[PDB]
Structure formats: C-alpha cells, structure tokens
Amino acid sequence: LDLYPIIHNYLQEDDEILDIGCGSGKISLELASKGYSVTGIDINSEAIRLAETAARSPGLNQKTGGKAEFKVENASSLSFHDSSFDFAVMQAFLTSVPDPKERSRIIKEVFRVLKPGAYLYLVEFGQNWHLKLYRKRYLHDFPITKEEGSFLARDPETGETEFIAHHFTEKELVFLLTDCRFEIDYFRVKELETRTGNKILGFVIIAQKLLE
Amino acid sequence: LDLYPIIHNYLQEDDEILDIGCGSGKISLELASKGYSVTGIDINSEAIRLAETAARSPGLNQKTGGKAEFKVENASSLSFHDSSFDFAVMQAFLTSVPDPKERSRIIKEVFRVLKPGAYLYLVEFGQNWHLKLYRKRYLHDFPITKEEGSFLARDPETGETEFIAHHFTEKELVFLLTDCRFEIDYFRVKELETRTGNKILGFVIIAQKLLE
Ligand SMILES: [Ca+2]
Ligand SMILES: [Ca+2]
Numbered sequence: 001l002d003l004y005p006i007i008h009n010y011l012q013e014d015d016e017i018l019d020i021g022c023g024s025g026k027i028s029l030e031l032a033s034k035g036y037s038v039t040g041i042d043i044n045s046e047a048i049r050l051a052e053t054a055a056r057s058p059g060l061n062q063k064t065g066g067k068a069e070f071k072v073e074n075a076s077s078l079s080f081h082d083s084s085f086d087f088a089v090m091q092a093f094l095t096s097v098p099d100p101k102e103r104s105r106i107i108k109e110v111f112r113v114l115k116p117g118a119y120l121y122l123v124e125f126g127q128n129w130h131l132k133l134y135r136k137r138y139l140h141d142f143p144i145t146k147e148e149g150s151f152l153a154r155d156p157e158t159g160e161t162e163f164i165a166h167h168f169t170e171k172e173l174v175f176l177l178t179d180c181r182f183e184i185d186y187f188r189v190k191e192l193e194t195r196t197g198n199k200i201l202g203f204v205i206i207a208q209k210l211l212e
Numbered sequence: 213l214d215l216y217p218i219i220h221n222y223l224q225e226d227d228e229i230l231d232i233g234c235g236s237g238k239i240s241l242e243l244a245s246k247g248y249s250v251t252g253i254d255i256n257s258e259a260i261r262l263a264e265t266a267a268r269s270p271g272l273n274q275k276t277g278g279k280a281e282f283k284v285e286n287a288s289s290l291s292f293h294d295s296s297f298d299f300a301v302m303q304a305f306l307t308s309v310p311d312p313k314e315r316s317r318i319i320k321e322v323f324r325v326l327k328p329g330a331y332l333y334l335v336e337f338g339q340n341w342h343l344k345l346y347r348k349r350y351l352h353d354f355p356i357t358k359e360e361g362s363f364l365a366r367d368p369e370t371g372e373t374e375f376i377a378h379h380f381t382e383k384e385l386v387f388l389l390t391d392c393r394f395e396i397d398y399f400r401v402k403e404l405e406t407r408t409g410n411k412i413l414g415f416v417i418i419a420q421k422l423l424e
C-alpha cells in the first residue's frame with residue numbers, strides 16, 4: 001500500500017503531518033524523505049521501535065527539510081493538543097479497530113488534533129461482496145464477530161484466529177467522517193492490495209475539517 | 213530461519229557452496245558476507261532477480277573473499293557438472309516439493325554435483341503430531357494431498373489454497389539421505405519458525421557424501 005499521488009495535491013510545504021497507525025514507519029519515512037515533518041503514531045512499542053530503527057538508516061532522502069518522529073499512542077486518546085497538525089494520514093488503520101464506537105472516537109480525536117480546514121488522507125478496504133470468497137468469509141464470521149464486514153484473519157497453516165479485520169461500506173465510512181464534521185473533498189474506489197496480497201476494492205478519500 | 217552455527221564447524225575457507233532454493237538470497241548473501249563463494253539456485257526468475265538486486269547493495273560484508281552468484285535452476289535437473297561443489301545448503305526447500313519421487317531426484321542431483329566427502333547442510337520441518345492444530349491440519353488435508361504430512365497452506369482472509377507444504381518424519385528424511393549414499397554426521401531436533409511464524413519442531417542435519 002503506497003501513498004496515492006493525490007495526496008501531493010493537498011499537502012503544503014510546511015505541513016506538520018500525523019501518520020496514525022504508522023506500523024514500522026514506511027509511510028512516515030517516505031513523507032519525511034519528501035521534505036515533510038511527520039509524527040508517526042502507533043499503539044505498540046514494537047512497531048515504534050522498528051520505526052526509529054529504520055529512521056536512523058541514511059541516504060534515503062529525495063528532499064531536504066523533512067523529519068520523522070515516532071511515538072506510542074492510543075488513537076482514541078491522543079496526548080497532542082487541539083489543532084496540533086496540518087494534515088493527517090490514516091492508511092488501512094481503522095480496519096484493525098474492531099469496535100465501531102472506538103472508530104468514531106478515533107475520528108473525533110483526529111478531528112480534534114487537526115487545525116481548522118486541515119485535510120485528512122484516508123485509505124480503507126471496502127466490503128467486497130462481489131468476490132465470492134470474501135462474501136463467504138463475511139457470512140462465515142459474522143456469527144463470531146457480530147459486526148457486518150468484520151471477519152477473522154486466520155493462520156495459513158493452522159487456521160487459528162490471528163485477528164479481527166473490518167471491511168467498510170461507503171455509507172459507513174462517509175458517515176464516520178461527516179458525523180465528526182469532515183467534508184469529503186476527494187473520493188475514489190480503487191483496487192487495493194491486502195496485507196496478504198489479495199486484490200480487493202477499497203476507498204481513497206481526502207476529507208477536510210470544517211471551519212467552526 | 214537463520215543459519216545454525218554448527219555449519220561453521222563443517223565449512224572450510226575455500227569451499228564452493230551451492231544454496232538450493234535460495235529464494236531472494238538471504239542465506240547466500242550471508243555466506244558470501246562471511247567470505248564464501250556461493251551459488252544460489254532457485255526455480256523462479258522472480259526470486260533470482262530480487263537476489264541479484266540485493267546482491268548489489270553494498271557495505272554488507274564482515275569478511276573479504278566471498279562472492280554470490282544466482283541462477284534459475286530446476287533442482288531435479290541441475291546444469292552443473294559432477295563434483296562441482298564442496299558444500300550444499302538446503303534450508304526449508306524440500307518442504308515445498310510435493311512429489312516424494314521428485315524429492316529423491318533432487319537429493320540424487322545434490323549428491324551428483326557434490327565432490328566426494330563433501331557435506332550437505334539440511335534444515336526441514338518435522339511432522340508435529342503433538343501439536344493439536346497441526347495434527348488437525350494433517351488429518352484434514354490428507355484426503356486432498358494424498359501424502360502423509362503434506363497439507364495446504366491457505367490464504368488468511370479467504371481460505372483459498374495457496375500451496376502444498378510437506379512436513380517430514382525423521383525416518384523419511386534419514387532414508388531420503390541414506391538411500392542416496394549420504395551418511396548422517398550431525399542431527400538435532402530443534403524448534404523452528406515457519407514461513408508464517410509458527411513455532412514447530414524440525415531437524416538440523418549435516419550429511420556427508422560417501423567416498424566411492
Ligand atoms: Ca483457514
Ligand atoms: Ca494471497
């Protein structure tokens with residue numbers, strides 16, 4: 001999952017960027033390389049440690065000016081102040097958050113730490129009902145997950161449950177955003193690659209935080 | 213899956229090493245780094261391409277003298293001459309070969325391209341019957357694979373069959389080797405990590421090619 005080019009139409013030179021769910025920091029470091037100041041955020045210290053590791057390795061940059069810092073954070077309770085950031089990126093993050101109420105609380109937090117009229121770049125997987133094998137997985141796991149579009153990712157050799165993944169409907173994603181006072185500025189359905197190599201449909205969205 | 217230290221008791225300074233099933237070349241490059249001349253072999257050009265890619269990247273070496281070359285090969289029909297190599301490494305390779313007759317033909321080829329009294333370093337996964345989830349997988353897939361210890365690795369999100377994996381019994385591995393005139397010099401049962409992160413028991417073996 002790379003950064004879609006569209007993001008560069010909305011970024012401005014001195015934007016302070018929050019990367020929510022940075023993992024081991026691929027995207028944060030790519031933005032830093034392009035001259036942006038980015039804070040990469042993640043709940044687990046493992047990922048954050050790896051990210052600061054990667055962040056040392058040199059000669060990466062295609063531009064000057066950027067920097068990347070990483071911090072362990074709980075996205076439904078950010079340490080940062082209101083209006084701390086010019087831009088947020090949320091790439092395949094909410095998909096790993098099993099509680100729909102937890103997801104709104106995260107969006108409210110992003111809204112809070114973003115300045116007025118700041119943009120949010122969001123990429124998520126859609127519910128691929130049209131794909132027989134995904135329809136089957138959704139049908140099979142609903143009785144367990146009890147949420148529509150949430151299913152279990154399983155160990156390939158063993159079939160043991162590893163984690164809960166959620167796929168979104170357009171309606172659901174749109175309202176998650178517009179209920180927290182974002183406006184949709186850019187929206188595409190795209191073919192995305194899952195963390196396991198499947199080609200499925202998802203969404204690329206640029207939302208803008210409304211002025212008070 | 214790293215190289216077990218034992219290998220360094222059997223390697224000699226100017227050994228020419230064959231790495232069968234080199235993938236993207238992690239192990240070949242590690243041996244090259246340590247000053248060995250190594251040929252990394254793999255059936256698919258993708259892996260080989262990546263390997264020559266990785267092989268360009270610099271500053272890796274902890275010793276001088278080594279080099280790594282990569283070639284697309286079919287292991288049951290090697291292009292190399294008899295007695296071409298002082299040492300062979302076969303790490304989690306045979307596990308991906310679904311035909312037990314194909315596996316003997318590979319061992320015969322390794323025997324052929326190895327010099328008299330050369331060593332073979334082999335690492336493989338054992339049949340973990342003691343692990344309930346592996347016992348269950350073996351039981352479930354036998355009717356499909358029709359080979360004992362062979363099962364299907366499945367897509368984590370979708371459950372679709374990706375590939376056939378084989379786990380070995382000690383008897384089976386021992387005879388695969390001793391039927392082709394190797395003698396077992398070193399043998400350990402170790403806890404290994406699967407390509408998907410499972411901790412299962414397997415084998416580390418140093419076999420020696422018998423003198424004619
Ligand atoms: Ca499964
Ligand atoms: Ca796949």
Ligand SMILES: [Ca+2]
Binds near residue numbers: 410
């Ligand atoms: Ca696992």
